[PDB]
């Protein structure tokens, strides 16, 4: 396992190079503005994002050391969380809007088009506002997204011991980034806590999101099937 041998800078550059691209949504002027077309637009978007996410997870240091069964388990538990923190990160520079795609920028008013989605829209907007106030850096974001992948399914399975040591290495990487940014020792621990507490909210948004999803893409049906 070369994940534990990586330095902090090597861990950051590895995570940055693994980043998936920003995908575009379908732009069909024939489709009407409705709940079915909006959901079809979001479903089609997340469906193509999942293919890139699976390829991204292979490049997360330590992930390929896990058995195939555990890799499947981690992705099933965390896929919506990872889509959400990506959405929240893309929406930082757009206050009051969610950039689902460069050609799909939505505010909370348009989120009312689907029944019950505006509550989750408001939670995603507040999380995006929290990142903007903290001035979340890209190097911190890629660490947080890898933490979600490794942590969200670790207590629902020896293999747990390896994941925990990789998670500690990512913690060392976050501290290295903050100490490199001039923060004091006190500010480092405080910011580390603020970032990790947001992951509790991202988990909350995913669970509330999944709950509405398996009530109303064959790959998504299987990912959605794992949480029920």
């Amino acid at each position: 396992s070369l994940a534990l041998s990586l330095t902090a800078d090597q861990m950051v550059s590895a995570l940055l190079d693994a980043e998936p691209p920003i995908l575009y949504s379908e732009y069909d002027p024939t489709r009407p503005f409705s709940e079915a077309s909006m959901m079809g637009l979001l479903t089609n978007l997340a469906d193509r994002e999942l293919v890139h996410m699976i390829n991204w997870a292979k490049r997360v240091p330590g992930f390929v050391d896990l058995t195939l069964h555990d890799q499947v388990h981690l992705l099933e538990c965390a896929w919506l969380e990872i889509l959400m923190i990506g959405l929240v990160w893309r929406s930082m520079e757009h206050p009051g809007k969610l950039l689902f795609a460069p050609n799909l920028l939505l505010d909370r008013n348009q989120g009312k088009c689907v029944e019950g989605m505006v509550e989750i829209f408001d939670m995603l907007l507040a999380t995006s506002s929290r990142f903007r106030m903290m001035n979340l850096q890209g190097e911190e974001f890629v660490c947080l997204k890898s933490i979600i992948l490794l942590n969200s399914g670790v207590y629902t399975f020896e293999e747990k011991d390896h994941i925990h040591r990789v998670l500690d290495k990512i913690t060392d990487t976050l501290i290295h980034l903050m100490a490199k940014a001039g923060l004091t020792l006190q500010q480092q621990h405080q910011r580390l806590a603020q970032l990790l507490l947001i992951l509790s909210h991202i988990r909350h948004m995913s669970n509330k999101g999944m709950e509405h999803l398996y009530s109303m893409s064959d790959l998504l049906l299987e990912m959605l099937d794992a949480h029920r």
Binding site: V51, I54, K58, L68, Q71, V72, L75, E76, D218, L219, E222, M223
Partner: peptide, 9 residues
């Protein structure tokens, strides 16, 4: 499983 196959390729 689709996720199982994509992780193998």
């Amino acid at each position: 499983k689709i996720l199982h196959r994509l992780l193998q390729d």
